[PDB]
Amino acid sequence: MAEGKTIYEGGCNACHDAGMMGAPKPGDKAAWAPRIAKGEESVIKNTINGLNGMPPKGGNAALTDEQLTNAAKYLISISK
Ligand code: HEC
Numbered sequence: 328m329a330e331g332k333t334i335y336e337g338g339c340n341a342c343h344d345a346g347m348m349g350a351p352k353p354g355d356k357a358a359w360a361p362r363i364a365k366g367e368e369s370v371i372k373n374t375i376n377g378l379n380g381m382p383p384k385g386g387n388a389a390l391t392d393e394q395l396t397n398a399a400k401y402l403i404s405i406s407k
Contacts, residue, residue: 334397335402348380353402356407359402359406363403367399374399
């Protein structure tokens with residue numbers, strides 16, 4: 328499978344598929360739209376660095392910045 332989706336399915340989904348803490352669900356256009364509108368760069372920085380209940384790197388210590396980038400892009404791609 329594509330890398331961003333594979334990464335997503337291995338733990339990010341625990342919070343995101345359920346919307347825990349207000350995490351934006353995959354495919355939830357309305358949730359994602361204002362997050363996308365600030366630019367992909369901001370979205371990627373928040374994925375790497377963490378934002379509120381979103382842990383740095385999703386709490387997956389093995390991932391590269393490029394892998395985190397590809398998982399954030401996957402979520403953006405399916406939620407527009
Ligand atoms: C729960 C413990 C989480 C895990 C595990 C992951 N995410 Fe998450 N994410 C979470 C929350 C609560 C939020 C919203 C934060 C807020 O206060 O607004 C998010 C948000 C994201 C975003 C959007 C960031 C933005 O610029 O608005 C992305 C792209 C995102 N999360 C990606 C992501 C990925 C790729 C993860 C696994 C590697 C992952 N999250 C795990 C909560 C949780």
